[PDB]
Structure formats: C-alpha cells, structure tokens
Enzyme design. Structure first.
Site, PDB file in Angstrom:
ATOM      1  N   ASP B 290       0.895  -1.549   0.153  1.00  0.00           N
ATOM      2  CA  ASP B 290       0.072  -0.121  -0.353  1.00  0.00           C
ATOM      3  C   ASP B 290       1.029   1.150  -0.281  1.00  0.00           C
ATOM      4  O   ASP B 290       0.764   2.052  -0.610  1.00  0.00           O
ATOM      5  CB  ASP B 290      -0.589   0.393   1.734  1.00  0.00           C
ATOM      6  CG  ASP B 290      -2.125  -0.976   1.217  1.00  0.00           C
ATOM      7  OD1 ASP B 290      -1.275  -2.100   1.825  1.00  0.00           O
ATOM      8  OD2 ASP B 290      -3.167  -1.309   0.747  1.00  0.00           O
ATOM      9  N   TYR B 374      -9.953  -1.378   1.530  1.00  0.00           N
ATOM     10  CA  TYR B 374      -9.104  -0.821   2.965  1.00  0.00           C
ATOM     11  C   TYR B 374      -9.029   0.076   3.555  1.00  0.00           C
ATOM     12  O   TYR B 374      -9.257   0.853   2.205  1.00  0.00           O
ATOM     13  CB  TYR B 374      -7.985  -1.692   2.306  1.00  0.00           C
TER      14      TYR B 374
END
Ligand code: CU
Ligand code: CU
Ligand code: NA
Ligand code: NA
Lengths: 620, 620
Positions: B290, B374
């Site tokens: 990420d 997420y």
C-alpha cells in the site's frame, strides 16, 4: 431475587450468628476466609439456597475448620477440622501483619542484627511475608511468616527506599515465637529517600496539564438492577465480588436478536503469584500468592471519583467479613463505567460513494488492590463487537534490596546502593466457559506454512490447523507465538448460519511463563504457571489452580491433580485456565514509584455471530 | 523557519514551475510522486535548502525520470532517466484506477467472460490491482495492472459482496491494451448484499447509546508552532507528512530538566504489504504494497470532528501534488489530540499512611487512509512516562472471492457462496534512532533460565543476557516470545547517574512474519517481512525496506542489499527496521464491514532517565 447478588451486610452477620449458635465461633475463633458459594448446576425451579464457605482459624492453637453454612436456612451444612500440615495453612490474617515486627522488636537476635547496622528498632518496619515450603522441618503444621526489614526515617517516609539486606527472620504467629534469625552480613542500607510527594525530589509540579472533562449528560448507557446485574449494549452479566478472587464475572451473555446467548459462565483471576529470581538466601524463598495466600479482594482500595476512575462512574461497595464475622463495607471498591474506544469500523467506498464511520465503546469493570508495596488494578472490558478482555495494571513501589558491590545477574540497580530483585507477576484466569451453553470443546489453532510445489506453484499459500483437545491429559498447552497459536472454545452442538460450530478465540500475549527450575518448590506450588493453557472438566470443588489452601502448602493439590482424572472435555462442561504474566527486570524509571505496566488476554467471537454484531450501532 | 515544516501549496507550485522552466514537465508528463527531502546530517549553521524529490511519468511511453529540485534556489539539482525494467515501475497513478475497467469494457474476451456469467458490463467494477512480478516475460518494462471483477447491482451497492471468481485480466495502462484475459471457469457470484447502511440488514438502529462528551474547557495542553512543531508534556517533535509514508515524525525528543534529549530522529511506516495466501491462479499473484506501490498518504481521509476523532482536536491539513504538479490540500487529514490514559502510578502505603494516585495521558497523532476495500488508521502515541507507541487499525471491507463447494484450506466462508482469502497485513517501521544523539547501538535481550545447583540451590534464579549487534551482517533478527526477547537501543557514550548507557527497549507483539515459501516472488520482494528486526547504518538513500521503486520490481534493492555492505553499527548512526503484522483468517464477524483489529509496537525508556520522569505530574 438473583442468586448471584452480592453478599449483604445482613447475610454476613447471619453467617456469624449461625456459626455462633452452632458453637463454631467462640472468642478464640477468627474468620480467615468467608465467601458466598455459587449456585449448583441445574438449580432451575429449585428455590434459592444462599450458602457461604468459611475458613475458621483458632488463635489458641486448635485446628482450624472449613465450614459451609446455609444462610437461607440458618444451618451448618458441613464443618470439618483441617490438618494444615497436610492440606495447607489458612490464608494470612490482616491481624498477623503487625505481629512479625512486634515479636522481632524484643528478640535479642533481631536486636543484635539491628545494632550491628546502627538501626533504631523503633524505625525498622518488617514486611510480613508468606513463608512457602522449604527445608525447615519445624515449620510443617505451623503458621509461619518471614520478615524482611526496611527503615522508615520518619512517619511519612517510604521505607522501601531503605531495605536492610543480609537479614531475615522467621516467626510463628500463633505461638508468638521467633523461630530463626539469619544474618549473612551487613550491607549498606541505601540512604536516598524515595518520597515521591517531597518537593525536593519531584521539583516544581507541572502547570502544563489542561483539564480533560469526561461527562455523560444523559447518564450512562448501562443499567444496574438487583444490586449487581449489568445490562449494556446487548451484554448481560452479574458482577460478583469475593475476598480471595476480587471481582468475579458471572453469566456473561450477549443478546443476539431475541435470544440471550451465554458466553462465559464464570470469569475470575483464580490465582496470582509473584516469584522472585534472586538466589540470595535472604530472598530466595520469596513467592507471593497475592490471591491464594493474602486474599486480594480484602485489600481492595476505596476508589476516588475523578482520580482512580474518571467519567460517569457507578460504584459497587462490596461487603466482606472482618476477622470476627462482622460485616465491613469496601466503599466504592468497584468502578463501573463505559468509555469511548476510538473507531469501531470505517470504510470510504469509491464505487458506492458511501462513507461510513462508527465509534467503539467498552464497558469497564474494575478494582484496585494493595498488598504491601504492590498495587494491582484488575480490569474487565466488554466491547461492542463481542470481544471480552482482561487487563492487569501493576504499579506500586518495587520490592527492594541492596545492590551488590560488583553488580548482580539477578538484581538491577535503581539508585546508589539500591537494588530491585528480578521477579515475575503471573496470573491465572479461570474461565468457566459456556459458549451458547455448557456443551463446549477447545481446539488449538496454529498457522500452517505450505511448501512451494504442486497445488502451490507460486509459493504463496498458507493455512491453519485445529486440534481438538479431547481429554484432560491432552489439554495442558504451551504458547507458540511464531505459529500464531490461539485456542478456540466452541459449542459443537450450536452452529451458525454457515453450519460451523459457534466459537470464541482466546488471544494470549505469549509472555514468558514461570522461569524457575522445574525442580524448585515454586515450580511445584505454582505448577499452573509453567504452562499457558489448561482445560479441565468442570467440578464444583476445583476452584483454584493452586487448591483451596496455598499458604505453606506443598504440591499435591490444584491443576496437576485435577487433570490426572483424564476426563472427557470434548463437548462437555469445561473450564479454561490461562496463565499470563509479566517478567520484570526493574529499571531506574520504576523508582521511586512504578509507572503502570500491563498484561492480559482477550477472547474474540469466531463464527459466534451470523455477521458483524455492530451493524445496528448508530452514526455519530 | 523550521526546515522540517510541512510542504506548502506555494512550494509545490514552485516545484511545478521549476520543472516546467527546465523542460521536464510538458503536457505528457505526470507527477507520480513528489515529496520534500529531509535536511542532510550536520546542516548546522548552513542556511536552509528545501529540496523536493519527484518521480515523473510520461503518458506517451517515454522513460520516466527521477528529479531532485531545490525550491529555495529555483534549480534542478539532478534529473535521471529511469529504466523501469531494471529499477522498477513508478507508483500507481490515481488516474490509472479507472483505466482497467474502461479498457476491459470493450475487450471481446472480457465481454465473453461476463456474458458466460450473465453479467451486465455496466454493473461490473474492476479493481485496479498491482501486478507484481511473475512468469509473464512481456510485462517486463511495461506498466501493468491486473483486474478482478465485482458486481455492483445499483449505484450505492457494495460491490465487494459480489466477487466474480474464476476471472482475471491483465492490462497495459500506458499503451492502453488488454494483454491477457484468464477465465478458469464460472463460479456463482454471491447474491446476498453487503449494504451495512441498508435498514433491512442493520435492523432498527440502537437507541441505547447515551452520549459521551469529551471536552477540554481551557483547550489542549499541547502547542503547535511553525505549522507542525508540537510541544506536549516534555515532548518535542515535528509532524511531517509524505504522500508515500503518510505521517512521519521527526526530532522526537524529551525535555529532561533543562536539556532537550533526542530519542528518535525519524519514525515512519516505510512499507506495508498485504500478501494473499490463496493458491488459486485468480489471486495467487495478489500482494499489495500500500505504501510502496499505491502511496498511502495520497489517499488520506478528511477526518470529521466528533466522528473520526473525538475530543478537542487540532488538525493539520497537509498539501500534496496532483498528477500535474498543482497543490491539493487534504483538509483535516491529520488529527492531533491528547487523551486520558487511566492510572499512571498508584500506591497506598500502610507504613507512611500516604495514598498517591496520578493519571496518565497520551498525545495522539493520527491519520486514516483508504485504498480500495481497505481502510487503515495509523496512530502514534507519546505517553507521559516516555513511552512511544505505534498502532495500526485495520478495517474496511474484506477482499472477497467465491467460497468453493466442498470448502477451502485457504479461504474462509463469510456468507452463502462468499469467501475471504487468507492474507496478512505486514508493516515495516523505520526508526532512525537518536538515543541522546546519533551514537547508538542495539542489543538483543533474552531472558536466561538457570539450573538448580550450586549458587542457585532453591532453583529460583533467572537472569537475562544482552548481545550487541556489531555489524549489519549480524543484525537481522527474529522474535523469540518464549524467551521474552526484546531489543535495546542505547547510546554507549551517554550514561545515566548509575553509570549505565541510556537506552530505550523495543517491545514487539511477536506476531507471525511473512508466511510465504522463501522461494516465492513475494518472499523476495518483501524480504524485510521475513524477519522481525533489521539494523542498518544510516545512509541518505536507504529510505524504504523495498527500495524506491516497488511496483513490478523484483528483488535486488531494499534491506537485503543495504546490509550486504556489512557496516559498523556499534556506536554509530543507525536505523532500526521493525516488521510487524496481522495474520487474518477472516471470520463471519468481519462481514459485511470489518471491526477494527490492531497491531503495533512500543519503545519504553530503559535507564534513559535517572528516576521516574513523571514525579512532577500533579494530583487530580
Ligand atoms: Cu514487578
Ligand atoms: Cu485482513
Ligand atoms: Na463450562
Ligand atoms: Na540514527
């Protein structure tokens, strides 16, 4: 009406009256332990029978008794004389604390020792320490305390700053005799004071802290009924209190739609032990079972508003017996409040355009106790999402010694000449499970790594395995942090909507367990502390991991004897006993008063619910 | 005046202007990354030079560039063309997210796949997923995203409820070509909705939650100066923000008496990876970096008052570059507040009669980011007692798949036909240490058990050992929870009053590290994640554990290459890199939106101070 209600002052006075009437509580008798017994299993349509268990000491040297009284019926159910050399001495009485110092103050050996160190006897405090079981044959069947000395320079001085090392005494607190005084040599008594309210040490107090105000303008979201029945955000429980275990939670259940679903029948800290790791003969015997030997509940603090407990607090004020059977209230001894716990769930979705945030909360049930230098907070938490957690907060003043010239492998230095022996604080949580009822089982779940090969050509797969613990012989387990080991308690007869047994997963902190050599006295007396998890078949008389009488009691009782029975635990009424602890190598920052350190565990729902249980929590 | 101040809108526009003026930012150029560089070491009396690092992508297919600009001087310091096949592709651009779905919508293979499943293309969302490095030779030097499909039944529907399994596509986002469409067979698309704001699923919302009000009537106890310099209860730091790393803490120091004592020079989460453990070819390539691939800072949420952050909140609103070099503010992207943290220290002393209670507080610096399904909260905490802690909060919607008929060893069932592949979330904290200055060393500390015998006759002793990590080859370490392993960072040239080197102890959670087979692509690309602790000698260009360019980049850069240098780390300027993560076997309770789960670490002073640092905290 609840059979789980707190003991009332009236019930305690009634137990006193029944014992008196029965000839069991004459003038030489003392109550060493008194507590209400939980209702038996079943006890459905049957009317309530409030029963109390009492340990009665005799100050004249007669054998103590264990007695069960029906306060409802005004009867003695059973009374049995105890042979303490066999089954253990009764818990230390608060009235015995002062006795060690008092007897030592006129003993010529003690006075010689103090004079060798130029210490005024009027200034020497003596800690009344549990004796354990070592090599001293004359102690067997005698109530012994050992005494370590600390100098108090003036009434408000912290004596812990001034340990008198090289000296220990043993005392028979019933016959009122000093059995032994051991002096291995003089050590300098550390001179710096440890007075954390003295401006000379604190310096000017900070003026930089602006107030934080926590209020609940409509009051708290929990209700209390029947004195101690709590209802909060789908949770239901009863808050018990016992002089040994402290706060005990009963009937922890969660209202899922229309149905009240049990999770835990009884949760308590059933033992806590503090073993010391200094091989000096002055302290090598030192192991404090705060729960089993001293009774932590008895020393619960009265908790001050906006100080010990912050926010909109509801207190319980549990009643205990004094040594004569008179009720004594511990005013504001239990704190209950709810608090915000940050974000519960959050998602900002690109595709739907919906942004969603919800906040978490927890219900907190706590007490704080003090035993000598130590102060422990016991906190139980219930979360919106179904999580149950326990946290212990350890603070107080570290137990000190001299710091040896040339250093030590078993003691750290806190201040010039001042040492702190290494030690652990190890707890046992006894969780009488009732996942959707009493038919439960435990599985050990480990992460499973997989090898790159056929069926896993990129070498990315990983899995897990669950092993059912079928009988008690197979249910003594150790942690394995590297493989992410946890334990799942499930109900094999209650399935969720996906046809999987409902369960809760116990997440441990995987801290070290008891460090002592397995052949030591403490490894036998605190056998529970050598392993992280035990599972037993429920039995009404298997209450503590160390048995009923811990004081000066060898191995022979407790968990190792319970599991020898090798009972079926695969879909039965079971009890999980989780060992967890702190290993403390004291640091300079712990002196002169220790910042809180914590340890604990939690249980999280694992397919217990059919989806998230917090979809109905409102915004903002 | 601070060289650590946040980037201003003006500086970003100035970088844009300098690049333009230099011929480096014509109409086909896009900014994939832009961030301020930290000041060089020393930089004492030297005037400030604010420098920015920029990665420039070219949408016409030309090679990208790495550029360093002096915004102070209006100059290009350096500009170098990148060979992405060698050193890695640039981070994913937000503008590329939509491209996968858009290109697939007119591809005949994709449409055939959707038609086989009776899915309306207008309703099929495609997640734009990082590609990694596998067996596809044509991808080398090409910017590829892979697409997994999810059906959205209506505009506000949660598409995650409806994964289209058995189907994946690969797309070249520069040439705008679909390279491959793989269809391994139809799976039922799960039908139940996952709409957590739909009253049909939530049921009636709770009316039982009474308000909690947290206020600070005199305002907060911290000050903010120079935009981002925080002073709070003896702590001093600067709160940075970077589009890759998110919130970065600089110059963490503690005012001990008169002296400002450095502790940590720079603290950040320098990488985070989410590896999936499902061997299905539809997902076996799935690993989301990420931080490194997507840039977590870029997607920081605007945080709403009384909702995301509760209490008396001070916000920072960091500025980032858009794709063209224009400044864009993330309004209220960083929350800063102090909160009560229970009891700090407590003792009720029998002998002195003094009862003492003090309360703890922590300063909280946080942000929350969203990448697809997420959502992660990053929280840094500073405590009164000197403790520093990081916590990550993982929530959002679980990444889904079909749940196979006959079950799975690598996927859990969430709802009828709905699966959640097993995965981990693994973070790397980069801690550029400065314990009392830059001359630091790391020791590994293990508990040491002792055998009953001479010198330990009662078998109670235990100890500990410390091993100095002297060179980088010796400084790649694993956890050992059973032996209570921690790591102490100390300054060998700065001693406390007891003549011991000052230090801080890192306490890890000892969660499992990367589970993938060591021969996998992810074990090489995320090598850092295979070990709990690394220590390197500081170098200005060793920023991330995965190197500067992670996207579609093989092994060869990052931590394994840094430590090959085998540099001296025994009393030198060092950097600790701590790997910590969650291993997630999704449960039914995680659906349809996941309750927060947490992971983190903390550092506690270990003989840093000469006594408790909180003796001057006032009562009540
Ligand atoms: Cu301790
Ligand atoms: Cu996850
Ligand atoms: Na049970
Ligand atoms: Na450093």
């Amino acid at each position: 009406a609840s059979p789980f209600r707190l003991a009332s002052a009236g019930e305690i006075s009634e137990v006193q009256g029944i014992l008196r009437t029965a000839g069991l509580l004459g003038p030489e008798k003392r109550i060493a332990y008194l507590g209400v017994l939980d209702p038996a299993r079943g006890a459905g349509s049957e009317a309530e029978d409030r029963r109390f268990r009492v340990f009665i000491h005799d100050v004249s040297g007669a054998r103590p008794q264990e007695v069960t009284v029906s306060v409802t019926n005004g009867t003695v159910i059973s009374a049995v004389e105890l042979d303490t050399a066999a089954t253990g001495e009764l818990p230390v009485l608060e009235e015995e604390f002062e006795v060690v110092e008092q007897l030592l103050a006129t003993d010529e050996r003690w006075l010689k020792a103090l004079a060798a160190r130029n210490l005024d006897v009027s200034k020497v405090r003596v800690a009344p320490l549990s004796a354990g079981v070592f090599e001293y044959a004359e102690e067997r069947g005698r109530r012994i305390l050992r005494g370590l000395a600390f100098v108090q320079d003036f009434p408000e001085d912290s004596a812990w700053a001034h340990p008198v090392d090289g000296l220990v005494a043993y005392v028979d607190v019933v016959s009122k005799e000093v059995t032994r005084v051991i002096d291995t040599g003089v050590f300098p008594v550390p001179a710096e004071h440890g007075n954390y309210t003295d401006p000379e040490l604190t310096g000017p107090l900070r003026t930089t802290q602006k107030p934080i105000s926590i209020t609940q303008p409509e009051g708290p979201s929990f209700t209390v009924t029947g004195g101690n029945h709590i209802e909060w955000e789908k949770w239901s429980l009863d808050v018990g209190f016992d002089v040994r275990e402290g706060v005990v939670l009963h009937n922890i259940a969660f209202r899922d739609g229309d149905r009240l679903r049990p999770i835990i029948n009884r949760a308590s800290i059933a033992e806590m032990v503090v073993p010391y790791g200094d091989p000096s003969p002055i302290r090598s015997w030192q192991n404090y079972f705060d729960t089993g030997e001293y009774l932590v509940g008895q020393y619960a603090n009265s908790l001050e508003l906006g100080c010990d407990c912050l926010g909109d607090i509801t207190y319980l004020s549990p009643v205990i017996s004094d040594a004569f059977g008179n009720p004594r209230e511990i005013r504001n001894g239990i704190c209950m409040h709810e608090e915000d716990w940050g974000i519960l769930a959050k998602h900002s979705d690109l595709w739907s355009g919906i942004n969603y945030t919800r906040r978490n909360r927890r219900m907190v049930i706590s007490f704080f106790t003090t035993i000598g230098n130590y102060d422990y907070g016991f906190y139980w938490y219930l979360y919106l999402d179904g999580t149950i957690e326990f946290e212990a907060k350890a603070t107080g003043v570290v137990f000190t010694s001299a710091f040896p010239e040339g250093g030590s492998d078993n003691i750290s230095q806190l201040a010039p000449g001042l040492g702190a022996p290494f030690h652990q604080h190890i707890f046992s949580a006894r969780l009488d499970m009732a996942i959707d009822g009493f038919t439960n089982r435990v599985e050990e779940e480990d992460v499973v790594r997989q090898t790159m090969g056929p069926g896993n050509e990129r070498g990315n797969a990983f899995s897990r395995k669950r092993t059912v613990l079928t009988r008690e012989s197979e249910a003594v387990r150790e942690a394995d942090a590297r493989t992410g080991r946890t334990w799942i308690i499930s109900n094999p007869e209650s399935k969720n909507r996906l046809n999987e047994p409902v369960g809760y997963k116990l997440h441990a902190h995987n801290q070290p367990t008891l460090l002592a050599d397995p052949g030591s006295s403490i490894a036998r007396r605190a056998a529970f502390a050598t392993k992280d998890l035990w599972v037993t078949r429920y039995a009404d008389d298997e209450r503590y991991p160390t048995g009923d009488f811990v004081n000066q009691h060898s191995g022979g009782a407790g968990l190792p004897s319970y599991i020898a029975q090798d009972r079926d635990i695969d879909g039965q009424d079971i009890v999980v006993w989780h060992t967890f602890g702190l290993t403390h190598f004291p640091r300079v920052e712990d002196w002169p008063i220790m910042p809180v350190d914590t340890v604990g565990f939690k249980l999280r729902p694992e397919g217990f619910f059919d989806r998230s249980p917090v979809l109905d929590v409102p915004a903002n």
